[PDB]
Amino acid sequence: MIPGSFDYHRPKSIADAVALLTKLGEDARPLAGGHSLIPIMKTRLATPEHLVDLRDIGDLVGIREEGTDVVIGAMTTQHALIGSDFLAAKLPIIRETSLLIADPQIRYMGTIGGNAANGDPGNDMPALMQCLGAAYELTGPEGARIVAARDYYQGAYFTAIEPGELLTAIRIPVPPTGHGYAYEKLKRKIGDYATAAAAVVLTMSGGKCVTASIGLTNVANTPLWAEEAGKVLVGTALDKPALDKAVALAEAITAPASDGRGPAEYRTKMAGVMLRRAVERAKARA
Amino acid sequence: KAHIELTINGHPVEALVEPRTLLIHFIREQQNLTGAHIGCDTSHCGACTVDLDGMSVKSCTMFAVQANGASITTIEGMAAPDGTLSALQEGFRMMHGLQCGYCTPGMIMRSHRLLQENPSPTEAEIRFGIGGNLCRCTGYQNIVKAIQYAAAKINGVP
Amino acid sequence: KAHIELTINGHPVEALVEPRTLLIHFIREQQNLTGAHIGCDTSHCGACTVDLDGMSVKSCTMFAVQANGASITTIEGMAAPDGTLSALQEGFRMMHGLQCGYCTPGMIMRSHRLLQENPSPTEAEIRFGIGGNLCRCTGYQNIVKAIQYAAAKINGVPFEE
Amino acid sequence: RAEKLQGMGCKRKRVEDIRFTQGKGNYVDDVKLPGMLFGDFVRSSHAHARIKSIDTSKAKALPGVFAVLTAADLKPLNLHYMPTLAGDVQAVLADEKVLFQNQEVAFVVAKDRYVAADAIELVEVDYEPLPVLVDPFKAMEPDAPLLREDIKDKMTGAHGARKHHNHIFRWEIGDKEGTDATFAKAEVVSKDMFTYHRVHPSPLETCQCVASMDKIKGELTLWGTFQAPHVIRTVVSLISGLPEHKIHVIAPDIGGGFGNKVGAYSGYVCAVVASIVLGVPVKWVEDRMENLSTTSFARDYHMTTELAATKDGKILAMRCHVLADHGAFDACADPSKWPAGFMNICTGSYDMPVAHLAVDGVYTNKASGGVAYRCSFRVTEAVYAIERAIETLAQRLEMDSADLRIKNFIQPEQFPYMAPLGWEYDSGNYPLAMKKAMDTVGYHQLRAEQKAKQEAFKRGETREIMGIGISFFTEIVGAGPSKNCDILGVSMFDSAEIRIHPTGSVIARMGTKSQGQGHETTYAQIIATELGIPADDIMIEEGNTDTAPYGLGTYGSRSTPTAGAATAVAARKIKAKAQMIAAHMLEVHEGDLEWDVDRFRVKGLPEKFKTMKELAWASYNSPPPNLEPGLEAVNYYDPPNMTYPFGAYFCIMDIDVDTGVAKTRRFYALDDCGTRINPMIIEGQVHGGLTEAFAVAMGQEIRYDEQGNVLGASFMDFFLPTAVETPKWETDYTVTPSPHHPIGAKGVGESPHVGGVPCFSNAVNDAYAFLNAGHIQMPHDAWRLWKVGEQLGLHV
């Protein structure tokens, strides 16, 4: 329950936050909504010497369309995502997913950026972002760079971010109008990280799938982008043979933990079931 | 220690806090507002819920320094200045929405915000809307009734 | 408010007080040492007596600011750390030197100083020596005995009977 | 004045709610006393190890730390172990070894809980691992580790002059010879091993106390989460040497107990010792992870359960043997003579000629407990055993299990019914309740619907299966008669004291202690009806051992059986004295008076009367010369028997065999607890208990791995349903009064859990019965029900 002592900072700008993180070093952590970091500080798994609260940086909050992308500031809360009718018009999968994250209190505080940057495979947004082919905008002392969400995750609490960098925004290509989408999550109760979950976006024409992308949540030490599984759907009617192929190729890449949510073998199968169900719902939406 | 200034239940508060002090401890220990409760060490139970800048917040998952400049309502702030119970407080009593009372402050504080988010919620909306709040005693059924009763009362005021 | 630093019952104390705050009220209301009592408004009763820089003082007739830098002992400071009561505290109980207890803190604090002034006082010296302390309950006779008991205890030998 | 009475049977709104809805409850952690410190424990990272050294120097040196106690500090006060309710001892601070993960090793006392937590991290313990024992089935093997070195020598088998060193007790009851003979010849023998898995009561408020030794006065005040505060006083007295009149135990508002707060914990002892040493108050408040992993677990019974029957479905005998995992110390709350509680109610609602029960308790490297979480002293286990055995027998007989129950119920005319393991049931009308329940849920129609759904499944038309869960149960609550029920030698009575003021209001106190069950509301309803005094004119208090009459506390649904009875009896003493006052005032014989709601009237001259209010005043103003002034009474009520409420619960469950996800379609709960004091409160008790039942059956668990690590002991994993997962509850009742109880009222609070768990588990088991799954062990969460289907070939 009780964290170790730390110093607390409120930088006024991205630049000042990056400068602070760079100066203070590895013992400094960004503080966004706090709803993953504070819990692990309370267990003393995390014992940072400094927290750099991003609360006063307005430029980290917001949702805009820029070109062919939606750009979401890292500090945009789950509650804000859900509330954005503009985002629901363009990227309705985000609201659907966010409503499957945590609980109202947590969603008031938790941010998209903190969900994406956290590195716990339990988080839902990572695999959604991989599904959507989002790019993460990172700013550090050496400047800005972009890392694809598909390339961002290496392991539990191991991501591509470098010392002194903040994830400042997530840039999400907007799927075509009329696209199908679904996020299907299996969990033990409200608030629980997925036993398995699947994010799907697809498009159809003339009864055939034209595009499909699939992400899988919490069925490996990272989110997974199920590249082969999505490709096998393309050119099919999204019928049983096609779904069975996609399920196979998705299951093949899983490597789940055996924990209170069940053993790895179950969770692999549940990735497949969630995938099937998500494809079905996406097909119907398409 | 950091100096903070905020408002709690409409009153100015100024204090010196260690950054690591959790908001729930600040409220209970330093401010002596012991209505808010601690029911867990993992952020699940919602017994520590307060209304903070228009949000339902689990105050065990926030440091007091993060609440600098905030406006917080705790359960002590729900009754009217003349002592009259809020619609929610009254509904929880009328509908037998509490037993031990331990979740109740958090439940009411969450519900206060719920009914601002959605003044006329369905039962599914209520149950989902309080999903961050655990109760051991009631089995939730009368809590739903309590919230519905409060909505009806609120909706009849204007 | 005035800043004061002093010592009470052997412990450092630092405080802010209004000049007009009576020492009795600082001790009772700010320091929560509620053994000392107020029995009067004219400085007669002695119920507020504390030991202050080697003097018996009626703390209702002193402002807290006047005690800046002082060393004060109140009744709470009389018992030993090990729990044992002082000779006076014991004598008061043994000789039935108190009833309601309201004068007792000030009687004992006065007596503490009396027995430093005069370790082996006669009865007349005792009575005179506590003349600034009123008691409503005891009629003083047992207080005298209590002080005699304490003196004899301290001295290792009795004096008067 | 009719509107004001709010007596028995009224849905009186709760007086407690005023404060609780406003945050003005007074729970232990709300207490702040001058100079109060905070203490908490350094806890064992090992399940089984010798303690080689404990270095507390860095912790003591930390600013703000006032003490660090180890067993070395307690031993001289004979407080390194504490007695348990079960007649064992439990280590307060670990001395030579630790025996369960998270066991208390040192107690750090600091300025506040933040500094205490810092200091705990500075204590260094060196351990020498010992072999871990977690599987109770192996606890009595010849090579099982010697856990309890403090009380046991090595004893590796079962034929030595002491039991196996890991064997706590063997308890048996019933007619072995007769039972064995019936099983040897019965046409059908139905045997299964049902495990009731370890769970935890997990009250929302954890265990905690504030100890304040006043060294000047030599008096200890102890605020705490105590379901049985008078018991705690007496125990604190026996172990501390302070006399009871100088120990002031205060159980204030308690944020739920659910059995977790009956016994004493190391934290209470250590806070007390620390306060005594330091002379200032010491608060101890545990966090959830420590609550779940170090305080009273529940269940953990492995029940080999057999029914003997004729092919036509008459039950001839029951034979049950239980292996009980008690963890490292036997701290299992129970009346002292009942080491397996009332597990001998396991013949249930059925009239069986003979039965036999044996229970062996064993030590393992786990937290202690057993009795908690609405078990009524192992009645959860008893009921699960029989209600599951009914279902497995019915499968074996190819009989509908409703019909099997009907064929075997104890009939109303048989009460009071002496059951074959010794309990005499007070009253019951089982056939009527069962019928009401079946009719309400449309039972036979459900079965036809189920059959059609099964056929559909086989035709590949649905991936969902339907189960119909039945639980018809007989509870036993109200411990209990002095002849056989005592808590560490104190007979299990309870008590009430009622005092009427001159102006007619009342203060009444009881020896129980609510943790949310509404006693402050409902005890006043009993009095209100008895005396004609409005309930709002009556103040109810519990929990201050200086003021409340001695009682045995609240657990085992005993409050209404014991203190509810005492309340009525005490009120009737007052009424009798009032009648004498009225006779004096009206100048008639007492026999010439009759009670009429709120007054005594002269028979045949109804215009001449005296009201209770008038009599109260008279008792002070014009006391009759033959009588003492005033108007008050006490009763300590030694019950003549337990009360035996019952219920008929039906669950319809739909299960997705591909994910294992079960969804309750409907849950109907009929409870009969005799006279119903407050229907609103009873309903809430049922809702709460059914939600626990759902949780236990469908997800909750505390587990240990082979290394003795405690698993799942946080709300990350411990299944507590939210409003989203919790089913809607349909409740119903019948009323079959307890003949021996002063107001005919039986206990009820535990009934929903007792009956509910088998109802849910039976529904799950029933869903898969057509697929021949056998007995599916709880909990019935998704991965485990997926495994059931996987193993049945349903996924290919």
Added chain:
Amino acid sequence: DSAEIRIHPTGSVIARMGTKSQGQGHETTYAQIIATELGIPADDIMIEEGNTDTAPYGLGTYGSRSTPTAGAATAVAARKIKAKAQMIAAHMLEVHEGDLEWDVDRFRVKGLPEKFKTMKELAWASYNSPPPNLEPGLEAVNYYDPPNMTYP
């Protein structure tokens, strides 16, 4: 005036009265009355007055009334406890109550002094093994209406 006396399982006592000391020593002296009546040392008895929620109703301390009224009540309440204790003793010792004699702090069987129960033992027995005809526990109240004043 009034007295309520409750004996705990382990033999200590809480007793309250309807008077209120202002220094007359009631907390000491009422316990003396009880001690002699019950054979329980005075130091084992806690006396309280003045909290109207807890103390039995009384008319207070003035008119030198406390000993005449609550002192009477204390003795009478204590005698009620003694009478119950004697019943418990007779049950435990398997004799008639008339076969018992009191010896400071215990009932002994007349002619057989080695057969006895102390008040402390009886207090525990009242909780541990209540005779079937009696309520558990060991306590009493008396509200004492004096027949006359006392005339020192």
Added chain:
Amino acid sequence: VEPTSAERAEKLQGMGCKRKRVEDIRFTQGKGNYVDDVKLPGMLF
């Protein structure tokens, strides 16, 4: 110790004894609780 009747009586410190006062422990140490010693949250004068 099998105390005599007289020893047992003496230990009682009952009727007729010059029993020393229990109140004196707190009063001699300033730990009485008189009205003006009471302090409650928010108390006015």
